[PDB]
Amino acid sequence: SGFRKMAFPSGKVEGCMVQVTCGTTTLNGLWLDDVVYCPRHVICTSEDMLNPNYEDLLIRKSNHNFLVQAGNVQLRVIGHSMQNCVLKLKVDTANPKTPKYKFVRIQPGQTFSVLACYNGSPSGVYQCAMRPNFTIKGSFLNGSCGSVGFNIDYDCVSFCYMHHMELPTGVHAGTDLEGNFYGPFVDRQTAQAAGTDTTITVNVLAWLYAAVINGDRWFLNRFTTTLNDFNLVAMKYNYEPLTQDHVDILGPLSAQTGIAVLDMCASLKELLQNGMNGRTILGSALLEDEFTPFDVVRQCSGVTF
Amino acid sequence: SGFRKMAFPSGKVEGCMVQVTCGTTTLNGLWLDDVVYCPRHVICTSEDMLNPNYEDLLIRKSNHNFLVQAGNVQLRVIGHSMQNCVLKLKVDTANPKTPKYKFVRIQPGQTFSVLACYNGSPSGVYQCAMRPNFTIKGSFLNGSCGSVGFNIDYDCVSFCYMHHMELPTGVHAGTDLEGNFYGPFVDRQTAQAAGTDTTITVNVLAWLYAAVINGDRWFLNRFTTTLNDFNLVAMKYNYEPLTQDHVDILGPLSAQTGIAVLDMCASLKELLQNGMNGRTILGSALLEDEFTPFDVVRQCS
Numbered sequence A: 001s002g003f004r005k006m007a008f009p010s011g012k013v014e015g016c017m018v019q020v021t022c023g024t025t026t027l028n029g030l031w032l033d034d035v036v037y038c039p040r041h042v043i044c045t046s047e048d049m050l051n052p053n054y055e056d057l058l059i060r061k062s063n064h065n066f067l068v069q070a071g072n073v074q075l076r077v078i079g080h081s082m083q084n085c086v087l088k089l090k091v092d093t094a095n096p097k098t099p100k101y102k103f104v105r106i107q108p109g110q111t112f113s114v115l116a117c118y119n120g121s122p123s124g125v126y127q128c129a130m131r132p133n134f135t136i137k138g139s140f141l142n143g144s145c146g147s148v149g150f151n152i153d154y155d156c157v158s159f160c161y162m163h164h165m166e167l168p169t170g171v172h173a174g175t176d177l178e179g180n181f182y183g184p185f186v187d188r189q190t191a192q193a194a195g196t197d198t199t200i201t202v203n204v205l206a207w208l209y210a211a212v213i214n215g216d217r218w219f220l221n222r223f224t225t226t227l228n229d230f231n232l233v234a235m236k237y238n239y240e241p242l243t244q245d246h247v248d249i250l251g252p253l254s255a256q257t258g259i260a261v262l263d264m265c266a267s268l269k270e271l272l273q274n275g276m277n278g279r280t281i282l283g284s285a286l287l288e289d290e291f292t293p294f295d296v297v298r299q300c301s302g303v304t305f
Numbered sequence B: 001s002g003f004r005k006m007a008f009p010s011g012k013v014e015g016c017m018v019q020v021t022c023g024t025t026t027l028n029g030l031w032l033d034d035v036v037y038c039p040r041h042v043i044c045t046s047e048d049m050l051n052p053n054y055e056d057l058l059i060r061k062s063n064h065n066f067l068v069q070a071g072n073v074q075l076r077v078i079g080h081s082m083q084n085c086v087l088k089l090k091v092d093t094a095n096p097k098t099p100k101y102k103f104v105r106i107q108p109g110q111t112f113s114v115l116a117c118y119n120g121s122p123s124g125v126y127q128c129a130m131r132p133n134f135t136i137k138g139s140f141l142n143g144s145c146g147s148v149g150f151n152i153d154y155d156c157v158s159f160c161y162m163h164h165m166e167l168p169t170g171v172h173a174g175t176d177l178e179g180n181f182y183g184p185f186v187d188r189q190t191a192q193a194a195g196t197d198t199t200i201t202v203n204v205l206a207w208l209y210a211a212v213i214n215g216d217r218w219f220l221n222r223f224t225t226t227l228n229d230f231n232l233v234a235m236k237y238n239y240e241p242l243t244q245d246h247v248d249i250l251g252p253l254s255a256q257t258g259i260a261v262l263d264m265c266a267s268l269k270e271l272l273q274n275g276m277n278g279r280t281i282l283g284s285a286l287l288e289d290e291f292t293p294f295d296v297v298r299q300c301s
């Protein structure tokens, strides 16, 4: 019993966190094998960031300009290259703590654990979702750039995010590990705004299934709906469209709880039109959308890593 | 900016998680140096649960009855002793991944990270508070016994909890690492019930300060209150009494935000009477009580 916002164990990622210092800037780097990945804005000062030519700024840097520190051991940089918005600092020493890993680009709605670091030192781990507007609602302070978002698949760390910046609303923007930003964001000091967000419909339904599994059934009703009728209501309440893929992915939960996906959709349709009526679902007065259908299964099944 | 329920990195604790098997029971053990700590009820059978005599059951045990597994390496048990409700299995190999650690007993309201494990394998990490009723609102399935609660302040892991049982309401009861249960709980199948839970008032105020720091100010008001008047109101909403210690602890946040503790108390009093009016505080429609004043200051560093 119990449902918590649960992150993947961060041990495999902690062994990769290093501190990258370039001039006045100090941020975090991900050390995998003999390469240290970090945001490319580390090479920039407050002057460069306004309109930065990163190719030109990098050509002026030498390997000794980058100070990489793994614990209290200074790593020597023997190369530097750039892949999109990530800087790849080739180092002489391969990280012995390098886990089995992949670089994966995630889609909006997909969740991941964030290992927040400051000065190459992990300070906290939290679970969050890639918003449909491509921002994350993280918890980050200055110096957390280079902090990574990840999932664990069996014994393989899939790195899916690297924190670059904080938008004026307090939401965060970053890239996948290939340096490609999530969303219409750029690593330059300019007017950037996160788009109007939407609710991750499949994740709300996944969390409603997790509430049923936990004994919270008040929101259930005798009704079912067409996927088209549900999507009309969802569109109106700033909810993401629920595709047939989402209905299929919610299948095992529908089987476990005995409530069809379109049946649970009718419960959500009612909750949107009438509210919670002072009641809570899993100790929450709002519909939670940061648990994917897989996260609910993993938590209510106890999958280990 | 941003406020999240944030757990401590679990790496230091993952390197200590082992699987402890005694007969039919398989739960988790914490391997620190040459000792494996796990709930003593691993030695319990079906009948020896309503009224077990743990001293007598453990005297019938030999070191080869306990099968400790660290990864795919079977650890050899060379001793076994009991300290309250924890079983201490002395092993022949000291854990090379053993971090700097302390055993600390926490008080209600105190928060900690929980590394949920099954079969000695960490599966997830989440944040908890020790409820005023001495239970935790965890997320645990069968086989999670021996999972630990911890805080990691400066290089050192302070172990404060070991999961022992799930109560009939779905809340969890466990012990500190010295085997002493939190609350009036026992490791017997006797009829046990968690007492009526209350809201951690100091933690709600700490989180209201975190909202002010983040730019949420709608709930603030021109009012202040006496500590006595605040407690009389809050106790009617099933809130913990706010002591002078809590007012002192909230001092740095009061200084940082410029809102006196008794002033923020009146904000909380208003929230209790009015509700949120369809508004949220830090993306939440309920008053959050699992963030201590120390958590807020650390997360808003």
Ligand SMILES: CO[C@@H](C(=O)Nc1cncc2ccccc12)c1ccc(Cl)c(Cl)c1
Pocket: A041, A049, A140, A141, A142, A143, A144, A145, A164, A165, A166, A172, A186, A187, A188, A189, A190, B001
């Ligand atoms: C200051 O360096 C970056 C930044 O915003 N860092 C942060 C990242 N996350 C949270 C922060 C909270 C407070 C303050 C700074 C935070 C930054 C600034 C502008 C641009 Cl265009 C880019 Cl790519 C990077």
Ligand SMILES: CO[C@@H](C(=O)Nc1cncc2ccccc12)c1ccc(Cl)c(Cl)c1
Pocket: A001, B041, B140, B141, B142, B143, B144, B145, B164, B165, B166, B167, B172, B186, B187, B188, B189, B190
């Ligand atoms: C059944 O074994 C224990 C237990 O509660 N395990 C669990 C621990 N946590 C969550 C569970 C969820 C579902 C089912 C079992 C869960 C147990 C039972 C009674 C006593 Cl008195 C003790 Cl000390 C231990």
